[PDB]
C-alpha cells in the first residue's frame, strides 16, 4: 500500500534511525519482542506503513543499515531493542567494512559490492505491489555516510524511476576544522547529488543543535548522546498524518507535493517547540492552540543557521504548521485567523502563499494525550546563507593547496571541483530570481 523503505547509512545515520525505530514501539503500544498491550489496534488504527506487515503480530522494521565502521552496530545487539531487528535482512553477526575514512572509499566500494548491495535490499521491494519510495537516512559528516550515499542516489534513480525520493539528512558541524579537514570536499559532492539526483531533502544543522541543546536542556559538556533526542521525535512527528489515521496529505507524496516550489529548491526549515518535561504540570488548565503557532514563525525553534537581518528581502512561499494530539479543533481556524494580521511571513510578490495546518490524534499515552505539540516544515528563501557559508569555505580551501594532491590518487583524474561550484551558484541565483 504505502510502504516506505528507510535507507539508514553511515556513522551518524545509523544512530539517528536506531532510536527512530525505538520511538515507534513506545507509541504503538508494542514491545520489540512481544505484544503485551491491547492498545495497538483499538488506539492506533494503522501500523503497517513503516513496519513490515505482520506474520505473528511481529511488526518487522523495513530497515537496512550499512556502514564501514563496525562500532555503531556493536552498540546495538546488547540493547534489548535489537531482537526486533532481523539478522538476515541486512547482515548476520560479525559484519565489518573498510579501514576507513575517505569520500572516495565508499564511492569506489559501491561497484565492487554491486552484486550484494542490490540483492537483499530489493527483497523488501516486491513485498508490496505499490511501493511508496525510498528515504535515505544518511549523513553528510564524515566520509562514511557521504561516500557511499552518493552512489545510491544515482543507480536508484533509473532502476526505480516512479518512486519518491526525499531524505532526512543531517548537516555537519563547522566550529573548528582540526579533527576533520575534509569537510568542505565530501559535503559539496553529496550536495550536488541532493538537488539533481534527488527530489527533496530535510536539512538538519549541527551548529543549530547545540543552540537548542543549551537553550532549555541545560548541559555543560556536549556529548553525542543528545543528538538522537531532537532528531527521533521530529521524524515520527513528520509521519503523524501517515502513521496515525489522517485524511489530507496522509502520504509522504502528499506533504512534499504541497511545499516544493520547483526542483533544486527543496530545502525545508524545521521547527519544534515542546521539549521540556516541567511544562506538564500547567497543561491541565486547557492550554489552547491559539498560542502555539505564534512562536513557530518567530525564529526561536529553528534548526537552520541563517542571518537575522536577511529576512526582509526574502519571502516565505510555503509554511507547514502541524498540530498533534489534543487540538481543540473549534479554535484551529481561530489560530489561522491571527496569521494575516501580523504578517510574520513575508509573502512572495509574484504569486500566492499558503499556511497549511493539519491535525492527527497521537498515541494513547499520558505524555502524548496531554501536551500540545507543534511541528513546523517551513520553506524560506534565506537558505542560501548556508550555501554562501559552505561555498566561501570551499573556494578558500582550494587556494591554500589543501587536499589537491592527497585526494586525486584514487579514482579521480579530472577536476570536478568547479562542477560543484557552478551548480551550487545555480541554486543560489535561482532562489533570489524566484521572487520577481
Amino acid at each position: 500500500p504505502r510502504e516506505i523503505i528507510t535507507l539508514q547509512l553511515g556513522q551518524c545515520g545509523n544512530q539517528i534511525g536506531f532510536e527512530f525505530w525505538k520511538q515507534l514501539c513506545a507509541e504503538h503500544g508494542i514491545s520489540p519482542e512481544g505484544i503485551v498491550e491491547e492498545f495497538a489496534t483499538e488506539g492506533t488504527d494503522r501500523k503497517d506503513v513503516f513496519f513490515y506487515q505482520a506474520d505473528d503480530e511481529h511488526y518487522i522494521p523495513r530497515a537496512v543499515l550499512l556502514d564501514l565502521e563496525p562500532r555503531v552496530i556493536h552498540s546495538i545487539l546488547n540493547s534489548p531493542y535489537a531482537n526486533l531487528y532481523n539478522p538476515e535482512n541486512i547482515y548476520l553477526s560479525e559484519h565489518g567494512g573498510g579501514a576507513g575514512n575517505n569520500w572516495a572509499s565508499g564511492f569506489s566500494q559501491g561497484e565492487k559490492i554491486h552484486e550484494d548491495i542490490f540483492d537483499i535490499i530489493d527483497r523488501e521491494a516486491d513485498g508490496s505491489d505499490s511501493l511508496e519510495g525510498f528515504v535515505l537516512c544518511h549523513s553528510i559528516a564524515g566520509g562514511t555516510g557521504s561516500g557511499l550515499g552518493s552512489y545510491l542516489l544515482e543507480r536508484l534513480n533509473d532502476r526505480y524511476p516512479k518512486k519518491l525520493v526525499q531524505t532526512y539528512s543531517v548537516f555537519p558541524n563547522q566550529d573548528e576544522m582540526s579533527h576533520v579537514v575534509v569537510q568542505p570536499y565530501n559535503s559539496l559532492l553529496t550536495l550536488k547529488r541532493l538537488t539533481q539526483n534527488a527530489d527533496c531533502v530535510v536539512v538538519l544543522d549541527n551548529t543549530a543543535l547545540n543552540r537548542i541543546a543549551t537553550d532549555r536542556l541545560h548541559i555543560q559538556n556536549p556529548s553525542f548522546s543528545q543528538i538522537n533526542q531532537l532528531v527521533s521525535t521530529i521524524m515520527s512527528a513528520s509521519t503523524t498524518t501517515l502513521r496515525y489515521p489522517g485524511y489530507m496529505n496522509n502520504d509522504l507524496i502528499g506533504l512534499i507535493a504541497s511545499l516544493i516550489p520547483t526542483p533544486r529548491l527543496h530545502f525545508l526549515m524545521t521547527g519544534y517547540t515542546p521539549l521540556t518535561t516541567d511544562q506538564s504540570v500547567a497543561s491541565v488548565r486547557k492550554t489552547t492552540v491559539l498560542d502555539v503557532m505564534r512562536r513557530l514563525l518567530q525564529p526561536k525553534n529553528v534548526m537552520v543557521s541563517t542571518g537575522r537581518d536577511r529576512q526582509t528581502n526574502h519571502c516565505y512561499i510555503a509554511i507547514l504548521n502541524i498540530i498533534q494530539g489534543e487540538v481543540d479543533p473549534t479554535q484551529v481556524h481561530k489560530s489561522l485567523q491571527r496569521i494575516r494580521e501580523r504578517k510574520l511571513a513575508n509573502f512572495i510578490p509574484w504569486g500566492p502563499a499558503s499556511i497549511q495546518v493539519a491535525l492527527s490524534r497521537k498515541s494513547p499515552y499520558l505524555p502524548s494525550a496531554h501536551r500540545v505539540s507543534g511541528l513546523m516544515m517551513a520553506n524560506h528563501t534565506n537558505i542560501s546563507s548556508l550555501f554562501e557559508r559552505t561555498c566561501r569555505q570551499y573556494d578558500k580551501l582550494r587556494k591554500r593547496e589543501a587536499f589537491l594532491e592527497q585526494f586525486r590518487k584514487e579514482d579521480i583524474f579530472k577536476d570536478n571541483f568547479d562542477e560543484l561550484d557552478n551548480s551550487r551558484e545555480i541554486v543560489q541565483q535561482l532562489i533570489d530570481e524566484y521572487h520577481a
Partner: protein, 128 residues
C-alpha cells in the same frame, strides 16, 4: 403580585420546582394587609432562589466580569495582539473574504494572551 408571577415563571422555565411557603393560602380573613406583606416576603424569596440560580450554574458576576470592563478594555494584551492585526487589514471597508479572517484573528488573539475561561470568550461575534 404581577412581579411574583414573573419570577415564578423564570424558575418554571428551568423546571417545575417551587411551592408556596404556607400549606394553605388564606386571604378570606379580616387581616388582609399583613397577607400582602406575606405575599411580599414570598416574591423576595422567589428572587432569592433566582439569585441562587444565578450564582450556581449561570455565573452572572463572571458574565459581567467577562463582558463589561473587558469590553471597554480591561486586559489589553488580548486586544493589542488584535490591534497588531487591525493595522494590516483595516485600511478599507470589508470585502467578502475579510470577515472570515477577522474571526480567525480574534481566536488567534485569544490564546496567545492566555484566557482563563474559554467558554466565556467564544461568545464574541464580529459586526460587518
Amino acid at each position: 403580585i404581577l412581579s411574583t408571577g414573573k419570577y415564578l415563571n423564570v424558575v418554571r422555565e428551568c423546571g417545575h420546582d417551587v411551592t408556596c411557603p404556607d400549606a394553605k393560602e388564606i386571604t378570606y380573613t379580616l387581616k388582609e394587609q399583613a397577607y400582602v406583606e406575606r405575599i411580599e416576603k414570598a416574591y423576595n424569596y422567589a428572587s432569592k432562589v433566582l439569585l441562587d440560580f444565578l450564582m450556581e450554574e449561570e455565573e452572572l458576576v463572571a458574565h459581567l466580569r467577562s463582558i463589561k470592563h473587558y469590553f471597554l478594555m480591561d486586559q489589553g494584551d488580548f486586544f493589542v495582539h488584535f490591534m497588531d492585526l487591525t493595522e494590516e487589514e483595516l485600511k478599507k471597508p470589508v470585502d467578502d473574504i475579510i470577515p472570515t479572517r477577522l474571526e480567525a484573528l480574534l481566536e488567534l488573539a485569544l490564546r496567545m494572551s492566555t484566557a482563563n475561561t474559554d467558554p466565556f470568550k467564544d461568545d464574541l461575534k464580529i459586526e460587518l
